Amino acid sequence: MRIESPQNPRVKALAALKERKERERTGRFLVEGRREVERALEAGLSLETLLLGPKARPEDRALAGGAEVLELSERALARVSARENPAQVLGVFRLPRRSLAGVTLGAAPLVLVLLGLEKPGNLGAILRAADGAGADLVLVAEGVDLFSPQVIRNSTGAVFALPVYPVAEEEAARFLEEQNLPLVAATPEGERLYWEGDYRGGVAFLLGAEDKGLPEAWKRRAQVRVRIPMRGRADSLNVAVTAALLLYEALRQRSGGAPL
Amino acid sequence: MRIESPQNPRVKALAALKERKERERTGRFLVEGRREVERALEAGLSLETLLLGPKARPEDRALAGGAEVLELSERALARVSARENPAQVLGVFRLPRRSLAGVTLGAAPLVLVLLGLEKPGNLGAILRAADGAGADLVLVAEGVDLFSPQVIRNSTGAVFALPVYPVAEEEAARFLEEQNLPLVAATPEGERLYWEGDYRGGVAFLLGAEKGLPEAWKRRAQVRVRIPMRGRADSLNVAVTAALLLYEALRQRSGGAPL
RNA sequence: GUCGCAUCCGGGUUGGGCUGUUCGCCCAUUGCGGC
Ligand SMILES: C[S@@+](CC[C@H](N)C(=O)[O-])C[C@H]1O[C@@H](n2cnc3c(N)ncnc32)[C@H](O)[C@@H]1O
Ligand SMILES: Nc1ncnc2c1ncn2[C@@H]1O[C@H](CSCC[C@H](N)C(=O)O)[C@@H](O)[C@H]1O
Numbered sequence: 001m002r003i004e005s006p007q008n009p010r011v012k013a014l015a016a017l018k019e020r021k022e023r024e025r026t027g028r029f030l031v032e033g034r035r036e037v038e039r040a041l042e043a044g045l046s047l048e049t050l051l052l053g054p055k056a057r058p059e060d061r062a063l064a065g066g067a068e069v070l071e072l073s074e075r076a077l078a079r080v081s082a083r084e085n086p087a088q089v090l091g092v093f094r095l096p097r098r099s100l101a102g103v104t105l106g107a108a109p110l111v112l113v114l115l116g117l118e119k120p121g122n123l124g125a126i127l128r129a130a131d132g133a134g135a136d137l138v139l140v141a142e143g144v145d146l147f148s149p150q151v152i153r154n155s156t157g158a159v160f161a162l163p164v165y166p167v168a169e170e171e172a173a174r175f176l177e178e179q180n181l182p183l184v185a186a187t188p189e190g191e192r193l194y195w196e197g198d199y200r201g202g203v204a205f206l207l208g209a210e211d212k213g214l215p216e217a218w219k220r221r222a223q224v225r226v227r228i229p230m231r232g233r234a235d236s237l238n239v240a241v242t243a244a245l246l247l248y249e250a251l252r253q254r255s256g257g258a259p260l
Numbered sequence: 261m262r263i264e265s266p267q268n269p270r271v272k273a274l275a276a277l278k279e280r281k282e283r284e285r286t287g288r289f290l291v292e293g294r295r296e297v298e299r300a301l302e303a304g305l306s307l308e309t310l311l312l313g314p315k316a317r318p319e320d321r322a323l324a325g326g327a328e329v330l331e332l333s334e335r336a337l338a339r340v341s342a343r344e345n346p347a348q349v350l351g352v353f354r355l356p357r358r359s360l361a362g363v364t365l366g367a368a369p370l371v372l373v374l375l376g377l378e379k380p381g382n383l384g385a386i387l388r389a390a391d392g393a394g395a396d397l398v399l400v401a402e403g404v405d406l407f408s409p410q411v412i413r414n415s416t417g418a419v420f421a422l423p424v425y426p427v428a429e430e431e432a433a434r435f436l437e438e439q440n441l442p443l444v445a446a447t448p449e450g451e452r453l454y455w456e457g458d459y460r461g462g463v464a465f466l467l468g469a470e471k472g473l474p475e476a477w478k479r480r481a482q483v484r485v486r487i488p489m490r491g492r493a494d495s496l497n498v499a500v501t502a503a504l505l506l507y508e509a510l511r512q513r514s515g516g517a518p519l
Numbered sequence: 520g521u522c523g524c525a526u527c528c529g530g531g532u533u534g535g536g537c538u539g540u541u542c543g544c545c546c547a548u549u550g551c552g553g554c
């Protein structure tokens with residue numbers, strides 16, 4: 001089926017998926033970009049509709065594997081895309097079902113706990129860093145939706161394969177207690193420099209919201225509160241930069257380095 | 261005195277500052293956000309006009325220091341702002357003009373050399389990381405605009421006091437040579453892990469745009485270092501890379517040993 | 520600020536928030552111009 005008019009009803013339906021409410025109502029979501037579509041397919045997500053733009057290449061069509069295939073003009077593509085410059089390959093996938101029930105951790109896991117994050121770019125960047133550092137688990141507690149377009153783009157598709165689970169704040173606390181994982185709260189006023197923590201054992205790093213930071217209750221639960229030094233005018237670092245810094249310090253230590 | 265119409269001639273001139281062309285012509289630029297205005301002031305920049313919206317606080321007016329204060333309606337504010345939901349505190353500052361010529365670094369400086377043209381939002385975030393880690397100097401391409409709205413917003417205002425200088429490549433190479441600063445190229449294919457470099461005596465990190473480094477710079481570097489990537493992702497965001505590198509140097513200057 | 524015109528029930532065509540701001544972002548809800 002070929003579609004030209006940006007006013008085609010399917011195009012309005014497709015463009016609607018950029019909204020979290022439509023994703024919840026339909027159970028489906030949009031994945032934009034060849035790499036991102038590849039990663040969703042490779043992660044086992046169920047493709048319902050492949051969207052091909054005018055400058056798509058022959059191999060793109062072979063990705064559909066039985067899903068409906070729609071050709072879109074540059075005009076209709078522009079409406080469906082979340083990007084100033086539209087990608088040429090997109091996929092409508094069924095939202096995945098994932099629960100922490102099936103998750104088992106090894107002896108010394110590296111875990112990230114994200115509490116209240118609001119900016120989808122920050123979440124995507126954290127997921128990219130978690131991929132780089134080999135994080136064993138990412139718990140997203142009450143933040144922006146994991147399948148927001150910018151999470152997919154900023155994660156370069158890593159959101160689909162990463163062990164990342166949206167959880168309620170209370171379930172995060174429960175799961176952390178159940179797993180007996182030591183909690184390390186990252187907070188700018190933390191009493192200990194982050195380099196001075198030992199992360200060779202199992203560890204869960206707690207990161208707070210971009211505006212208000214970690215709730216006092218969560219800082220209290222942690223065994224230790226760590227800080228990343230601020231030597232200039234900024235009072236705080238970006239949440240994703242902080243997560244990366246913590247993950248790589250732990251990786252440094254797990255790669256042979258000694259705590260400070 | 262209150263300015264209520266978006267069509268007021270003064271609103272027209274203030275909104276024109278959204279264009280770099282106009283900022284260069286007038287020598288003025290807009291800083292949106294109490295936090296950012298505060299940081300511009302504390303950085304020593306010259307406030308020419310303070311813009312106050314209907315919800316500004318009494319203390320906001322006292323920031324003016326003899327600048328003209330304009331009270332703007334929400335409708336006039338929306339025309340000047342770069343945001344769907346504007347700030348109540350905006351400031352028209354004089355564009356600072358800084359040259360590298362004066363700069364003298366100490367014995368063990370922490371320097372970041374950004375090669376290529378980076379997008380504004382990424383640049384802003386790179387400069388915040390640099391501010392956080394206490395970079396002694398940041399060198400960017402000659403045509404880099406450091407007073408765009410995204411650089412101010414994504415830097416959390418850190419760009420105003422940060423020693424960042426848009427310079428020609430030869431000027432950059434020359435400055436680094438004349439300080440005898442070890443150059444460390446960050447590249448995914450680096451021969452060494454970034455933790456293995458020794459940054460206790462001074463370092464100039466070379467980082468390309470989110471892009472790649474030019475080959476001449478990679479070869480000239482004393483060491484090419486990589487950040488380990490244990491999954492499918494082949495690269496990290498440039499701002500994250502910048503932070504990882506700068507905080508590693510800080511780690512080593514804080515008693516840490518190279519891996 | 521204000522004035523048409525739509526549209527919806529005369530009365531509405533919204534509130535808020537934001538340490539990544541850009542075809543900005545988030546959250547409750549329930550339009551298009553002119554001067
Ligand atoms: C998003 S990366 C793009 C990669 C870039 N084209 C290259 O090959 O260097 C942008 C910048 O981040 C740096 N970078 C990103 N990930 C890195 C890693 N794992 N190791 C070293 N440098 C990295 C590179 O120096 C690069 O200039
Ligand atoms: N310098 C730093 N040290 C440790 N954690 C930091 C940090 N900068 C940012 N973070 C992390 O990023 C999150 C958002 S920063 C929140 C800022 C708030 N003014 C505050 O002071 O808490 C924080 O909750 C923390 O998890």
